[PDB]
Amino acid sequence: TNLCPFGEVFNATRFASVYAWNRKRISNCVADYSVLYNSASFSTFKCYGVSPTKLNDLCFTNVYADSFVIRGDEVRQIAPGQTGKIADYNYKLPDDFTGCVIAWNSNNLDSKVGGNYNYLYRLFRKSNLKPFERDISTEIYQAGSTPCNGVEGFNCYFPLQSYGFQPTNGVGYQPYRVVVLSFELLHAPATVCGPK
Amino acid sequence: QVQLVESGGGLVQPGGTLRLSCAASGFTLDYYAIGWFRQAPGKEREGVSCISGSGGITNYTDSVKGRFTISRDNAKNTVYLQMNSLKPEDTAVYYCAPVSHTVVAGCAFEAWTDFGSWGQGTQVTVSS
Ligand SMILES: *[C@@H]1O[C@H](CO)[C@@H](O)[C@H](O)[C@H]1NC(C)=O
């Protein structure tokens, strides 16, 4: 039928912060993954539960496309079972994830000479996120045994920080755009097929 | 005694340059937004420049925008204030103190309401 709007996800001018990650639902469409690999600006293109070279053979009930910016050296946290402040406090995949993780260096768009101000990550949380949970709160975080009463001060931390990407950062610190495609299989007819 | 000991400073002519720094004593800096403040002769301490915990966001008052650059090195627990194109009106004692983040992880100029541990500060004099 008609073709899945991957362009709107991958070529969006602006991306979300990882703590406030974006989700777009993809349904009732043909998903030609040749587009994606053919546009070889990708430095991460990996899948779980499916083979990356065989995507064009497959059908799913729904596909979800989550997207955000992190540092290059945090892309490794975007995977089932990983630990670290990104996997635990910002964006968590389930252990049984079926889908693909794609990432590419976005230094030319997302870094700014004054320091990018909008890309944030959560660095403190009372407990880990559940898979696909999204937390946008900005409550002062009680790191000690003294209650904070909503006021920032010693051991009473603001819970987000900015990456501050600048064009001159080394490559592990440069911004990467990330798209996580979830391949959902429910007891239902399948609405996202490739050119099998 | 939690404190941020200021260093650097001194006497320069108009158009001169200074770099102040302030090092955390009794705590570590990493998660805290820090401001630089200055107390000109007979005046209140005014915020001049602030930087968020990560270093990613900075803010400057009008009279120093374009001339001062704040930065930090969390591994050394130090914050810096590079001051260029100095003017007589920049003459003041300069101090560091923790400030609050804004809810978008930026920084505001006011020291924590609690905070009483100003240092000695460091003297800056700009004169002909
Ligand atoms: C992104 O834009 C380029 C240039 O217009 C295009 O070749 C590419 O196919 C686009 N990506 C997707 C996923 O459509």
Determine, yes or no, domain membership for A153: no
CB B105 to CB A123 under 8 A?
no
| Resolution, angstroms, 1 dp | 1.8
- What is the number of the ligand 1 atom nearest to the C-alpha of A11? 1
- Which domain does A100 fall in, by range? 6-120+162-193
Determine, yes or no, domain membership for A126: no
Name the residue among A114, A124, A160 with its Cβ closest to that of B105: A160
Q: How far apart are CA B59 and CA A162, in angstroms?
A: 14
β-bridge pairing A192-193 and A29-30:
parallel
Contacts with A159 (C-beta within 8 Å, 6 or more apart), sequence order: A122, A123, A124, A125, A137, A138, A139, A140, A141
Nearest CA in chain A to B33: A158
A119 Cα to chain B: minimum distance (Å) = 10
Q: If you compute the radius of gyration of chain B from its CA atoms, what whole number of angstroms results?
A: 14
- Provide residues with CB under 6 Å of ligand 1: A 6-7, 10-11, 35, 39
Determine, yes or no, domain membership for A155: no
Ligand 1 center–CA A10 separation, angstroms: 8
Determine, yes or no, domain membership for A86: yes
Q: Is A7 helix (H, G, I), strand (E, B) or coil?
A: helix
Obtained via which technique?
X-ray
Determine, yes or no, domain membership for A59: yes
Determine, yes or no, domain membership for A25: yes
Q: What's A55's domain CATH number?
A: 3.30.70.1840
A5 touches chain B (CB under 8 A): no
Chain B residues with CB under 8 Å of A138 CB are: 103
A4-19 burial string, b = 16+ CB within 10 Å, else e? bebeebbeeeebbbbb
Contacts with A59 (C-beta within 8 Å, 6 or more apart), sequence order: A190, A192, A193, A194, A196
Q: How many structural domains does chain A have?
A: 1
Q: SS3 letters for chain B?
A: CCEEEEECCEEECCCCCEEEEEEEECCCCCCCEEEEEEECCCCCEEEEEEECCCCCCEEECHHHCCCEEEEEEHHHCEEEEEECCCCHHHCEEEEEEEEEECCCCCEEEEECCCCCCCCCCEEEEECC
- Which domain does B59 fall in, by range? 3-126
**Cα-Cα-Cα-Cα dihedral sign, residues A162, A167, A169, A175:** positive
Determine, yes or no, domain membership for A112: yes
Residue A99 backbone zone (phi > 0: left; psi -120 to 50: alpha; other: beta): left
> In one letter, which amino acid is A95?
D
B107 Cα to chain A: minimum distance (Å) = 11
Dihedral, CA of residue B60, residue A112, residue A158 and residue B70, to nearest 10: -30
Q: What's B35's domain CATH number?
A: 2.60.40.10
Helix (H) / strand (E) element for A24: namely strand A22-26
**Cα-Cα-Cα-Cα dihedral sign, residues A186, A191, A194, A196:** positive
Q: How many structural domains does chain B have?
A: 1
Contact present, A41 and A47 (Cβ < 8 Å):
no
Determine, yes or no, domain membership for A145: no
